[PDB]
Amino acid sequence: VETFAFQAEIAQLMSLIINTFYSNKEIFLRELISNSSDALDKIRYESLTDPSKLDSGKELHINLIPNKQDRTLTIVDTGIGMTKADLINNLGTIAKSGTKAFMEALQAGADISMIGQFGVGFYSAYLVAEKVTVITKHNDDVQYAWESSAGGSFTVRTDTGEPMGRGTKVILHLKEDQTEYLEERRIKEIVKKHSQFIGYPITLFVE
C-alpha cells in the first residue's frame, strides 16, 4: 500500500467541496460520466488503426450500479483505463492549472456546476461521497485500486478484486444524507438532464 499526499491546492479544493454546502450536487454524476466518455474516446480512436487494442473487450459503454445495502453508487466504463503512473499523476499528485482560479470563483459565488470547465470535475464526487474508490485496468498493465476519504492523502495498491478486462470503475460510498443517488428514477433523471448527449450507452442496473 503506497500513500500519497494530494498536491497543496487539490487538497484545499477537496476541503472546500466537503465543508461548504452547495445546492446543485447532482452535477457530480455528469462530471464522472464525462471522464468515462473521454477515456472511451481514447481507446475508440486507438482501436481504429490497431484492433489488438480491443483484445480486452470490444464494447464501449458506461454502467451505473446503485447498491442500497452497501450505500454505494458505482460508475463502470470500458474506456482505456489508467496505468499506475496515470493513476498517481492524474488523480492527485500533479497540480491542475485551473484549481486556484476555481477556488477563487467558488469564493466569489460561482455555482459548483462550473467545476468541469476548470478541469477539476473529478473532485465533485466529494459533494456526495465520504470515500471514493477508483479501480482501473489499462492494456499491458495490472489492475490498481486508488482510494481516498480526503483528509489530505490517498492510497494506491495492486487490486486483488474481480478482474475488469479494461476500463475504470468509480465506487462512491455515499454520505448518509446523499442516498437519493441510489434511487433508480433520480439517477435516470440526472442522466437525462445532464448527460443526454454522451455518445456511449449509459445503462442503469436496477436492483
Ligand X SMILES: CC1(C)CNc2cc(O)c(C(=O)N3Cc4ccccc4C3)cc21
The answer to whether residue 77 forms part of the interface with ligand X (CB under 6 A) is yes
> What residue spans of the chain are helical by DSSP H?
8-19, 27-47, 84-88, 99-107, 184-194
Helix (H) or strand (E) holding 71: none
Q: Is 131 annotated as a binding residue?
A: no
Contact with ligand X (CB under 6 A): which of 72, 113, 148, 168?
Answer: 168
Q: Is 88 a residue that touches ligand X (CB under 6 A)?
A: no
**How far, in whole angstroms, is CA 98 from its chain's centroid?**
18
Q: Are strands 202-204 and 143-148 parallel, antiparallel or unpaired?
A: unpaired
Smallest distance, ligand X to C-beta of residue 91, A: 6
Question: CB–CB of 134/118 below 8 Å?
Answer: no
Work out whether 159 is an interface residue with ligand X (CB under 6 A).
no
10 Å Cβ neighbour count for 157?
A: 12
134 vs 150, beta carbon nearer ligand X: 134
Over the window 94 to 133, marking each residue x when it contacts ligand X by CB under 6 A and - when it does not, the resulting string is ----------------------------x-----------
Edge to edge, the sheet with strand 143-148 lists 2-5, 153-158, 143-148, 129-137, 167-174, 72-77, 62-67, 202-204
Residue closer to ligand X by CB (options 107, 165) is: 165
Count Cβ neighbours within 10 Å for each residue of 45-75 and write b for 16 or more, e otherwise: eebeeeeebbebeeebbbbbbbeeeebbbbb
**Least separation in angstroms between CB 17 and ligand X:** 14
- Work out whether 136 is an interface residue with ligand X (CB under 6 A): yes
Among 13, 88, 106, 134, binds ligand X (CB under 6 A): 134
What's the rounded Cα separation, in Å, for the pair 127 and 68?
18
Residues 27-66 that bind ligand X (CB under 6 A): 32, 35-36, 38-39, 42
- Binding residue count for ligand X, defined by CB under 6 A: 17
In terms of CB distance, is 67 or 90 closer to ligand X? 90
Shorter beta-carbon distance to ligand X: residue 95 or 107: 95
Q: Is 81 in the site for ligand X (CB under 6 A)?
A: yes
Residues 6+ apart with CB under 8 A from 3: 153, 154, 155
In the complex, the residues that contact ligand X under the rule CB under 6 A are 32, 35-36, 38-39, 42, 77, 79-82, 91, 122, 134, 136, 168, 170
